[PDB]
Amino acid sequence: GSSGSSGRSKTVILAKNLPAGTLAAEIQETFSRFGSLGRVLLPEGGITAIVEFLEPLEARKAFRHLAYSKFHHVPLYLEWAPIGVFGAAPQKKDSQHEQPAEKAESGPSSG
């Protein structure tokens, strides 16, 4: 619940309007041209492609740059990724939730 403060991801950006010809690698590199990348997920069922940037500054740079540009034959539509895109994981405190075994003794007085 830290990214929420802003509203949306600034390092992870999505790409819409991609030709069935496009490929994960193709995208990765195409972007890597501007700067190093972190993660890259592009499903076949959905043209849309997800690309995570290791740096927020670089990510934005490419956003505006690539923005208003066509990849192959169709125009590339960059869309910022949601804070929930990746989600959140549990912390140590979670463990605390667990209950002891002694509590077992706790019982009624009579039937």
Closest of 36, 62, 51, 55 to residue 86, by C-alpha:
51
H or E segment to which residue 60 belongs? helix 56-66
Experimentally, the structure was elucidated by: NMR
Q: Give the chain's domain count.
A: 1
Domain with 56, as residue range(s), is 1-111
How does DSSP assign 62-101, residue by residue? HHHHHTT-BSSSSB-EEEEEETTTT-----SHHHHHS--S
Q: What are residue 39's phi and psi, to 5 degrees?
A: -120, 160
CA distances to 7, 8, 13 from 39, in Å = 21, 17, 11
**Long-range contacts, 97-104 (Cβ 8 Å, 24+):** none
The CATH number given to whatever domain includes residue 87 is 3.30.70.330
51 three-state secondary structure: strand
